[PDB]
Structure formats: structure tokens, C-alpha cells
């Protein structure tokens, strides 16, 4: 049973890209479940616009999870997508907010995205010497992830300055 | 802050339907992640047909999770969809198979579906005296869930008799 | 070769639902062939409207036959759909009208539908204690079957009263 | 002119289902006109999201009115849909709000829906012994009606508790 | 609270166009309900063609009601669309026909359209000096309204001459 | 200026196919104008069904005219499609019926089609030795032309026998 | 057999609009046949772009002919669309060009359009006192007719000045 | 190089319509750029609904600019659409707001629309004696422009009265 | 391993049709590659129209290659589609033109088509006694192939006569 | 009011990418207006093909302007899109050609594109050390921009050599 | 005849990218013909799934060939796509398998893909210093090419290990 991988790629690197994506795979799965969670637990006068704004993102992220997963399998390894594998690779805490105003959930998500976008950014740099294709993959995602954050922030942005519920990891904005 | 619910429904029952669906909500979320997991980890000569056969089901189940969740929220409670809430309400073990033949994964899934279809069946009967609408909801699902199992089984069915990897909870069919 | 069935269903009932649907399966197959038959053998000034009115129904019924059939297979049994199995389970006489006015064919069909709708109605009641899902299945059909009859009747309806070619099993309306 | 009805249904029950739906028919017609009325008479910063949120519902309800009406006609009776028949069967008061904030109109609608959902709920129970199909019909509606209310409420919901403009029949919430 | 209106329009005229449309708004609402009413209460050999011919018109008119209504709101006033406002602005009698032949209902509708088309024609002339845009609006409608009448008439037209159930306000044609 | 034609075709035959199609081209142009003419000048209780039944045919024939025309041009000659060229190649009389019942117009058209279908049939046989492709072209048309006639006839067909307004060239059926 | 017309229109004017449109009806029919004629008889290096540019126009004009025709019928009269009625109402000469360069045909068409656009312009002014709706109808057309001419001219336009094959009724431009 | 224009239009008027539209052309171009500008520079809790509400308008206006431009070219003149031609024909000041709340931008836009709708209104009246078609063109636009303003205003409208940031040219509403 | 073929066809003929199509298969493959080649290597003022005109043809031919190939396989033999099999069955020279004016490439293609259309024409006649279905297949193609040539020629056609770069196998037209 | 930016990006670089894109934003806006300008001011025998060839590009560029703009906003800054901001950031001269042959406008555009493609190329290199995502963004554009230029050039290309109106900044090609 | 190229690219590099792509162009053309070849020559129980799995890939590759080709032309050179140019640039042997099991063909293709993916990988690295855009182009392809291989391999993969018909260039797997 000769283990395989992409033509012109060292098993060393293959396993290196494989591990990076697998961590990414779980970030996404956690995220499209979370996103969906805040989708149902939002309340406020601007309920509908944010309620609907989230769905396309959930759809988009689910695809990313799928893209990234099959890339691992193409790399030669086996992708892990059961609830356990998520909690396992997961390095942060399970989304804590529940029924609550849009303003709250948004502020919470903003932070969540800070986590995702910062790690992806890193993986892109790391991947550069490992596999340009897998790097291209994440670059594509990054742009869409970063754009969605701005939609969230723009909702919290200050009159002409910026963000409310300012840099306070894990809540901190009743204003 | 007066708690609400459906017009013509006793808070007693509301909370009763709410709890039933919340358990259902997690079964689905676990299932559409699992389904997706076996989607990427299948191998064999009949790889493509099963690879693709699974996707519509994943799409369908994700919707069910969504339907059921908003029903809870309409009931007055708050739906839980983060990875933790899954493992919490979850009463069985995280899908165990990984890269492996279609035949294996199918046999594994069959069993998984046995779990889901049997609990839904129960909830339907229970719900009958609680809320006909929520019961109708699950009835709809049940039919599609039951139908998908048959697709899986039909792949394991015997010449003219029935199922291979016969009633052996957690694997037991190298034939 | 261990025979299978739906999780949480007694082989006793499974075979009971199975038989009911199989009789239904043949009623449909007979019906979408008949419907199609009258579709080609109609004449009159209102030819086109009835000619086209029938097609959607033929399409709809064919699907019902398909739904019901796979339900049997999901139940564990084997569905029968060859011309013989039809004549076998069939308990009435093969549509007798041929080239003839819309008014005639409609009156003939009305009666045919009386047969189908009355038996389905029965099976629904019977199924109630056997399998709620299979019952739901037929309920869905029933509504569409009953609605189509009204389209047919509305064509025979009296000025403000009702039906022409009044209750006369097997023709009886040259008016 | 022999009066007709559904095969396997007692004229007694037919006329019983017929009357129930006819009352339902007018509730809908009143509702999709009202819904449309508040659609044009809304103002506020969250104008657009609610403006558009209402349309699908108006479209959906209009269909329900249509479904229910043809069911009556299939039952053998004659459906009434002119403005007079509405006011006649109508048992409550004509929507009273006019140009006004979303928050107001929503609170007003919430109450309106309380009326509709409570009566439909009743008719479902009543219909159970009369005609399962007609009951299935309304069950379907109910779920969509109940879901739309939640969209409205979610806009009035409290931080983590519930509804503003709390239980005050006919206005009572400037907060 | 400074009342507004269209740039370059005298509040005098604004309120003048506003009133004209509001009367139009109710004519439409009455009409798309009526149209729908005759849609369900038709019988005859040519049932289906007329049954279906009506729907597009109902859809079209509902839109007109919507167009006209938002024009009022754009004018600065508040549009009225509840069942009461209809009966209020309404100057004629609630459609009187019920279950009955196509020929009858058509003849009845013809007359109804005579009412609508004659008043719209008038409003167009009146509006000419008030607001060309609002006039353009109704002109558009008029053409479609007038065209639909011809479909109705063409059904009643004489061999090569014209209309049956000739000029007899409120029925008068058993031929 | 070397005249061209299809590779492997004798200029003798080319000009022979060319002439046949050019006569066909005018038959079509005359026909899709006529068809359209009777489309606007029909009256009766079954007005709508026949009104609409004609349009697809007009669309279809217009295409045939287009197909046939470019075939001529591909043959090397120049197709003629102005009103004059029609009257020129035309060998029969300009459709004579005007505003009149469906029954009349249909009977008139039936005859018109008898003309078209009989000449096309001939051209097919003639073309067989000239150019199989051009023959295939007309065969295709023929089937659709012949089918449309049956729609027309089926409207005039006798109880179980056949056609009314029986073989009477240029009218002859007030029954 | 009481002759009919549009509600609120004097038979005097009806017959006046009727005649104007009937002349228009033939102009269109002549035009969409002609347009089609030049569509097949064009040659040159820019063959394809003009070949295809013409089709949408033919489709558009055919519709105009249809619109205008049913307007006549709605007016109470009977529209004439057979090849004879064309030549009859026709006041100019049958398109004379045959196989020939785009440049030629375009120049020829330009002139043809000059005829159509100038007469329509007139009818619009005339109609103003007769029927605003029928006037609106032609105004709509005019814009599309005028726009298509510009496409044709733009092909003949001078470096920065204007039109080639300058004002020379019936050919006159080998340059 | 003989200058051209629309058949039946005096070069005097042509150049008159031409100039009017050219000013309109620049108003639009300025507007769909501005609209787009505020589309990106909005912030607030109701960010998404207004963010998206603007796009259809930008798309619509861009088309208007296109329609109007080709009308000029059809008139015989040459349309100007480069950034310079805008600033040139432009008679007001370049949109001044930048990153800022929806409420602000809306109030700013309202005023902008007041400018556009008032000038278009004028041009319509002026054009009436010049070219009915070009007048029809702008009438069409006007209705859509006026309607969009109402969407903007409805967001600023008072409880039951009207507009906030009341008549204060160039800002004046922190409330 | 019993060799198969179409029911009711002599292995003698099967192998005869098989060989004919296989030669056709390579002609197509060569052609849709060539067509594509000239698609990229065209230059001139009429570049775009011809650039795009070619694509549909490439798409169409590729399908023909596919149709024809599976027909061989259905015949019992094995279709050959690798670059070698092309050059093998190929009896002419590899397209020689490269970057060059439309006029050139067209003239070159014209000749290429002369080759294809003449051989197909032959195969049709030959096939007539072998297999009517396979003959029908090629007849269909032929018509589309012949039509495309005319598009090419029409670009080279003379003022009113015909083709430029007249009958000069392998170039010969700088005019 | 804490200023924000992308997670894992130094405010130093953010403002650096921001400025680069803002210059790009104006290049695009200038370009899709210009492109549109030449779209209306083209004349010649190949008018239509180039007229239409331009539209997709205008649509594409407008999107790029939108993409790039929201990227700035996501970066933390504020995008500028009013006519003034264009002229401001603009470093070249406003498109100078007006009504004129395709050949001219194309040659003019070619040069315009030389400007855009050369600056984008630069920004890509510069961005490489600043933000890979924003670099990816422009790379995507570049390919489409570069491809469109080739369409333009291919129209000016020499027999087998290259470009006409050879390297002559600001016109220089009457040939 | 001044030779051209992309703005901001040295003719040195242009010709360097040009040559790389031209080799790529032929690899693709060879591949989408081959792919298609194995598409028709497959047999087995899993025939259909692989039969259909291949088509999307053939469609995708054909596009790549098209993309890459126009990139060359945009670079200034001339793309070569005739069967000869393929065999010329081709450095390996023409696909050797013919009618044969899926398992065989897949194993054969796997190897073919090893060739393509390894060379593309190389060209990407090489191109990095030549033209980032052309590099981006191939990166995109690579990902899709690599993904398709995995579909092929997954069919040959071992129970939990990997690939059958293990590393044996040119067949070697009857197991
Ligand atoms: Fe997915
Ligand atoms: Fe997938
Ligand atoms: Fe979902
Ligand atoms: Fe949802
Ligand atoms: Fe089916
Ligand atoms: Fe099926
Ligand atoms: Fe409806
Ligand atoms: Fe209906
Ligand atoms: Fe509507
Ligand atoms: Fe609306
Ligand atoms: Fe056509
Ligand atoms: Fe054509
Ligand atoms: Fe038409
Ligand atoms: Fe029509
Ligand atoms: Fe546009
Ligand atoms: Fe345009
Ligand atoms: Fe294909
Ligand atoms: Fe195929
Ligand atoms: Fe855009
Ligand atoms: Fe945008
Ligand atoms: Fe392609
Ligand atoms: Fe291409």
C-alpha cells in the first residue's frame, strides 16, 4: 500500500500542508456552525438585515471547508470532520453568546473573525515555501473572510472614527 | 421581559417541544458533519457515485437543522448550535471510521441512521399530544431520512434477500 | 440474508404498509396510463384546454407512483411495476372510452377518480395505526388527486347546482 | 342538479369543513391586504428591511387564500372572496394603524397574528374528525404563519428576555 | 414635522393626485379580489381556459395596486389598503355573482371593467394638469386593463357583429 | 464572380432545390401571417384556448421560413422575402375569413393546411433525388405541420367519426 | 349585434384610431418581412455583425405588429394581416434590393426607416386628440424604431460628420 | 458630410433636445458615481439594508445614462461621458460626505435627489414642444428617480409627520 | 468473449459503418481543433465578429465528434480519439495558416469545409444501404456543416456574384 | 474611536495598501466612464461588433472599481468615488476623442490601456511586501485588463506583424 | 510592423512566457482529446459513474487550453493548435489504452496526470520571475488538475493505505 501525494511534492511538505489545512478545516467547521448559531439567536430592530446577511457567509464557509478538506485528501492524507475532530484541533473556546441583540453578537463575531483571519494570514506565509497552490487556496478564502468582517464591523463603526465595543476580548460593550 | 410562545400553546408544552427539537437539532448537526466526513473519506471502484450521492443529503439535512432551530426560537426558547452544544446533547459516539471503502462507510452510516430514524420516530409519537405542527415538521424529515437509508442499504443488500454487514453494531463486515 | 425494514417498525406492520402501497402503486400506474389515453382520444371545441389540462396531472401521478414505490422498497419489500402486476392488483375494469368528446371522457374520468380517491381515503385511515409517514405520503397525494377531480367536475357542473352525467356508473350522459 | 362532494365524505362533514375554511379564507384575504397596507405605511431607520421582509409573506398568504378557496369548491360549496364577504365573516376590527414606525406596526401585526394563529390552531383540532386532508392543509399554513410571527417578534424581543409593547391589545408601547 | 412631497410639485396638486390615486388604489384592490372570486366560481365546458386566463390579470392588477400605492406615499400622503378603506372609497356594489357559468361571470366582469376603465380614463385627463408622471402611470395600466376587457368580450362577441348579454347593467343574458 | 454551391452538388440540382424551397419559403411566410391573422380575428366561448394555441405555431413556422431561406442562400441563390415575392410565388388566394367564430376559422385553416401539407409532401418526394439534406429539412417541418392540423381538426372532429364542415373547399359549415 | 368599443370613447374616435393603427399594422408587417429579407441577403466582411444585429429588431417589430393589432380588435374593429391587406394599405414600393453588400442594404433600410418613423411621428400627433393610450403605444414603438435607425446609420456615418449614400432616395452610393 | 437627425424633426429642435439630454447625461453619471460612493461609505446598525438598497439604483441610473446618451447620438449629435464633461456640465458641488452614518448620507442624498428630480421635471415640460419621445424617455426615469427618493426619505420620516434633518441645504441634522 | 452489435444488423455492415464513422470521427476532431486554431489567430477590423462566430461551431463540432464516436462503440467496435489516431486516419494536410487576417483564414477554412462536406456527402450515400440510423446521424451534421460554410463564404462573396479568393486550393487571394 | 484594520496587518502597511488602491479606484472609474464614452461615439462598417464588444468590459471594470473600493474600506480607510476625487487622483488627461471611426477610438484606447496596465503591474510588485491578498486582487484584474487590450489590438494588428497607428502617444494613424 | 506585448514586460520575458504556455497549450489539447478517448472506451460495472465523471474535466481542460492560448496571443506571439503542432511540442507517447475496464484506464490516466501536473508545477516556478499573471493562470489550473487526479486515484486507492497498480509506468495492474 504505497502512500501517495501530488506529483512534484515531497512527502515532507505534503504532510506539512496537510496538517495546516486540517487545522483550517476545523476552524471553518466551527465557524459555519457558530455563524449559523448567531443567525438564529439574534434580536433587535435590525434583526432581519443581519439575519439574512449571515446566510451567504455560512454557505460560503461551508464550501471553504469542503475545498480545504478535499485538498488534504488530494495531498494523500485523510481529512477529519466529525464533531470530535473539531473540538480536538480547536484551540479556543466555544462561542459563548446566546439569544442577544445584533450589536452584541456582531461584536462577539468580530473577535471570532480576528482569530480566524489572523491564523489564515499566518498559514499563507508558512505555506509559501511548501505549496503555492494550497497557499492560493487560502488567499482566496482570506479575501472573503476579511470582507465579511468589514460588514460586521461597519455595523459597529463609529460616526467617522471606528469600532464600538472596542478591543475588549470576550464582550465589553453595552453602549 | 415577558417570555413568549406560539398563540394557543401552553408554556408547559412549548418547553416540552423545545427540548425535543433541541436534541433533534444536535442530531442533525452531528449528522451533516459526519455525512460530509464520509463524503471525503471514501475509496473504491464505486467512489464517485457514492461521493456524489451524499452531497444532496448533506444539503438537505443542513436545512432540517435550520428548520428545526427556528422552530425552537419561534417556540420562545433559544436554539444551541455551537460544537459544544452538539457534544453535550449528543448521546452516542463520534463517527469512528476514516479513510475506507464505500462498503465500510455505508455499513457504518446505516447504523448511524438507525440511531437517528429511531429517535425521530419516537419524538413524533411524543409530540403528537404536544404540538401537531412540530410533529408535522419531523414527519416530513423522517420520510427523507428513511429514504436516504434505503439508498445506503440498497448498496449493501443481498442478491434477493437483504443487508450485508448484518446487524453488528460498530463494524463487522469484511465481506 | 437478514430481511430489513424501517428503524422502529415491526415487520408485522412493515408488510402491512407494504401491501397497501403496492395496491396504490398499481392504481397510479393504471391511472397515469389511462389519463394519458384520454389525453390523446379527446375531441370537441374545448379540445385544447382539456388536452393540456391533463398533462400536468399525468406528470404528477407518475411521480406519486415513483414515490410510493420507493417507499415500499424502503419498507424492505420489492415493488411491482410491470403491466402484469398492474392487471393483477387491479380490481376494476380497464378504461373503456376511446375517441370521444371531452364531455364524455371527463364524465368517465370523474368516475375513475371516485374509485381512486375513495380507496386512498380508506388506506389513509388504515395506515394511521401502522405508519404515520406512509400515511402522510398518501395524504399529500389525496389532496392533489381530489383537486384534479374538481377540475374535471367543474367542467360538468350545473349552472349553479351540480354535476351532469349524474351518478350513472359507466356512462349515461348524452346531454 | 345533484350536489357533489369528495368521494368518501359525508355531506354533513363536507359542509362542516366548507364553513371552517370559508372563515379561514376571509382571515387570509384580510391579512394579505393588511400586511400589504403596513408594507406601504412604515417609516424608520430600519424601513427597508421590514419593507421587503413583508412582501414574501403577502405572496405566501395570497396563495393560502387560493389553496383554501379551491378546497371549498372541491368540497362542493362556493367560495366567497369579494370585499363584502370579508367584512361579513370578519369578526374583528379593520387594522387601525397608518403611517408609523416599524416598531409600532410590528407590535400591531404581532397582535393580528395572535388572532389568526389561534383560530387556525383551533380549526386544525376541529377538522381532525372531519377531514384529515383539509386539516393537513391548514397545518402546513400554520407553520409558515407561526414562523412569520417570530420574525415580527424577534424585532420586538427583549435583550435576552422577550417582547416589548408587552401584552397590550391594541397598542401600548412608545418604548 | 415638515410635510414633504415631490420636488417641483405644489402641495396643492400633490394632495390632488394623492386623492385620485387613493380612489384608484381601492378600485384595484376590489378588482383583484373580485377577479380572484370569479376565478374560483366558474363552471362550464370552457372552465379551464377562463380559469387560467384570469390569474395573470389578478397578478397584474395586484402590482398596479402596489405601484399606485407607493406613488401616493411618495407624494407625501399615506395609502389606505385595509378592507374598510376599500368599502369606504368604493362607490359601487360588491360583485354579486357566485357559482355560475363562464358566460355569466364574463358578462358580469365586462360591466365591472366598464366601471374601472371609464374612471381611469377620466383620472388620466384630470391628472394631465396635475402630474404628468402619475398620469403616465395610469396610462400604462389603462392599456392593460382595456386589453383584458377585450379578452372577456371576445368570449361574448357575436358571429361577426358584437357582444352578447348586450348593454344590460347587472345581468340580462341567458342566451 | 464565380457562382458557388454546396460541395458535391451539381449546379443543375442546386438550382432545382433552390426553386423548390423558394416556393416553400413563400408558403410559410404567407402562413405565419395568416395564422397570426386568425389569431386576432377569433371569437367564441373557446376563444382563449385557440387564441393561445396558435402562437407557438406562428413562432414555429417563422423559424421554418428562416431555416428554408438560409438553405437557399447556402445553395448559392438569393432568397426572396418581401410581400411582393410572396404574392408572386403564391398560387392560391389570400385568406378570406375575418372576425368570426373559432369553428369557422379552424375549418378555413384546415383547408389552408391541406394546401401546405400536400405540396410539402410532394417536394419531399421530388427532392429525394436532388438533395437528401434539403429533403430532411422539409421532412422535419412536415411532421410539425401535420401535427398542428390535427390540433385544428380534433376541434372539428365528429363524436367518434370525423371532421365537421366536411370537404367543402372555401367554407360550408354553419353547423 | 351591438358594436362595441373602449369605455369612454366615441365610436367616432374609435374608428379613427382603428384606421390609423391598421395602416401602422401593415407598415410593421411589411417591415419585419423586409428586415428579415435583408437579413438573408447580405454579404461582406462585416456580414455576421449585421446579420445578427437585425434579428432582435425583426423580433421586436413582429411584437409591435401584434400589439397594434390587438389594440384595433380592442377598439371594436377587425385587424387585417394577410399578405393582401399589406399590399393594399401599403403606399410605397416593395423593398428592391437583393443579394448585396451590407453597406448597400443598410443605405436602403435607412430610407425605409425614414418612411416608417416619419409616418409614426405623424400618427402620434394626430392620435393625441383621439386616444392617449393608443398614442402612448406608438410613442413606445417610435423610440425603438428611431434607435434602430441610428444603428444602421452609425454604420454609414462619416468620419466625424455624417451619413454616406447621402439623401438619394432609392440607392446612390457605391462609395 | 450631411449632418443627420430623426425623421420628421427640425435640426433646430434636435439640437435643443440634444443639449437638454447632455445636461441630463452628466447628472446621471455624477449620480451613479455618488450613489456608489455613499454605498461604500456608510456605517451604522442599519448598514446592510441601506448598503444593498443602493445597488439596484446605481444599476438603474447607469442604464438611464446609457439610454439618454444613445438618444443624443440618434438625434445626430455626439454624447460626452468622460470625467471632464461631467464636471463641465455639472452646475452643483461634488458630493461632500464621506465615511458617516446612514442617517447622514441619506439626508445628504435626499437633497441631491431634490436637485435631480427638479431639473428633470423641468426638462420634461420644456421637451413637450420639442420631442414627445425624448419627453417620454425622461418621464419614465422621473418615476423611478422619484420613487427612490421616497425610499431614502421614508428612512428619515417623522413618527407620522415627516422628514428629519428638515430643509437644511448641505447638512443640519445630528438628531 | 462474444463480439456484439446492433440488433438486426449484420456484423458485415456493422464493421462497414464503424469504419466510415471512425474516418468521420477524425475529420471532426481535426476540424474542431483547427477551427479553434483560427479562432485565436485572426486579425483585422472585423476581428470580434468572426472571433465569436467560430466558437458555437467549435462547440457544435465537438459534440458531433462525440455523437459519432459513441455510435461506433454502440456498433461494437472501439473509437479512436488520441492525436495519433487523428494524423493516422487523416488524409490531408494540417491547417497551414497562422496569425493572419480574417479574409485569409476564412478563405482557408472554406476550402477545409469543402473537404469535410464532400466526404460526408459521400458517406451518407454509402451508408444508405448499410444503416439508415447512422446515415440519419450524418445527414443532421451535414446540414449544420453546410450552413456554417455559407457563413464563411458570405464573408467572401462578391457584390452580387460570388466568392473571392476563387477556387485556388491552398491560398490565392490577396484581394 | 479606535481606528481599525485587517487582523495581522500593520497600520503602516494598511495605509500603504489603502493609498495604492485608491489610485487604482480612480483609474477604474475613469476607465469605465471612458470605455462607455467610446461605446456611444463610434462609427464605421464594423460599428456593431465593437459597440457590443465594449459593454462586457464596462460591466467588468465597474465591478473591479467596486471590489477595490470595499477592500479599502475593509482596510480601515474611506474610499473616494465622486467625480472630483477622480480628477484629483487622476494623473493623465481626460479621453480626447469624440465621434470617430472604430479604428481611431481603438488606437486611442490601446494607449489608455497601456497606462492602466503598466501602473497596475507596478502596484502588484509594490503590494507584494505589503498585503498578498490585495496583490491577488489586482493580479486577477490585470489578466482581464490585459486580455481586453489584446481584443483592441487584434483589431489594429498588421497582416502577420503587428499594431497599426504604431507607438504614437495621442493619435497618429489615418491609415 | 512593430511587434507588441504586454505593457511593462520585456520582449525577452514575453517570448519566454510565450514558449512555456505553448508547450502547456499542447499538453492540454492532447489531454482533453485523450480524456475524451477514455470516456468512450471504458467498460465495467462502474461504467456510468466514470463515464460521466470525465466529461466535466474534458470541458474544463478545453477551456484551459483556450485561456492559455489567448494569453500567448496577448503576449504578442501566435498560438498553435492544429494536430501537428500537438505532436510536435508533445514529448511523450500517444495514449495507448483502448477498450478496457475503468480500473485500467484510470491507472493509465493517473500516470498521464503525473506527467501534466509535474510539468505545470515546474512552469509555475519558472514563470515566477517572468510574469506573475501567467503564473497565476497556471496555478488556477494546477489546483483543478490536481483535484481531478485525486478523483481518479481515490478509485484505485487501497483499503486505508493507497494506490493500486502501484508506480508501474505504462500499465502493470491486473489486480
Ligand atoms: Fe458544500
Ligand atoms: Fe465536496
Ligand atoms: Fe441552511
Ligand atoms: Fe435560516
Ligand atoms: Fe418519475
Ligand atoms: Fe425514482
Ligand atoms: Fe395566487
Ligand atoms: Fe388559483
Ligand atoms: Fe405586489
Ligand atoms: Fe411593494
Ligand atoms: Fe426567426
Ligand atoms: Fe436567421
Ligand atoms: Fe408575436
Ligand atoms: Fe398576440
Ligand atoms: Fe449600461
Ligand atoms: Fe449601450
Ligand atoms: Fe462533448
Ligand atoms: Fe459523451
Ligand atoms: Fe457594481
Ligand atoms: Fe458593492
Ligand atoms: Fe472553449
Ligand atoms: Fe476563446
Amino acid at each position: 500500500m504505497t502512500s501517495f501525494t501530488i506529483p512534484g511534492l515531497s512527502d515532507k511538505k505534503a504532510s506539512d500542508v496537510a496538517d495546516l489545512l486540517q487545522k483550517q478545516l476545523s476552524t471553518y467547521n466551527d465557524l459555519h456552525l457558530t455563524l449559523k448559531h448567531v443567525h438564529w439567536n439574534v434580536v433587535g430592530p435590525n434583526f432581519i438585515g443581519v439575519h439574512e446577511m449571515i446566510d451567504p457567509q455560512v454557505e460560503l464557509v461551508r464550501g471553504y471547508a469542503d475545498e480545504v478538506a478535499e485538498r488534504i485528501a488530494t495531498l494523500g492524507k485523510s481529512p477529519k470532520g466529525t464533531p470530535g475532530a473539531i473540538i480536538k484541533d480547536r484551540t479556543w473556546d466555544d462561542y459563548s453568546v446566546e439569544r442577544d441583540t445584533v450589536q452584541a453578537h456582531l461584536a462577539a463575531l468580530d473577535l471570532v473573525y480576528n482569530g480566524v483571519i489572523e491564523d489564515t494570514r499566518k498559514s499563507i506565509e508558512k505555506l509559501e515555501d511548501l505549496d503555492l497552490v494550497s497557499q492560493d487556496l487560502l488567499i482566496a478564502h482570506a479575501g472573503e473572510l476579511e470582507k465579511f468582517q468589514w460588514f460586521v464591523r461597519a455595523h459597529l463603526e463609529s460616526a467617522g472614527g471606528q469600532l464600538t465595543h472596542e478591543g475588549q476580548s470576550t464582550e465589553k460593550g453595552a453602549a
Side-chain angles (χ1 to χ4, degrees), chain A residues 70-101:
Chain A
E70 305 187 342
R71 184 58 187 176
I72 284 167
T74 300
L75 282 169
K77 283 54 193 59
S78 185
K80 275 60 191 181
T82 33
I86 299 173
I87 57 184
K88 180 175 170 182
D89 309 317
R90 194 192 206 173
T91 200
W92 59 95
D93 277 297
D94 177 295
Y95 191 71
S96 296
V97 198
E98 320 198 61
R99 164 192 272 139
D100 200 322
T101 74

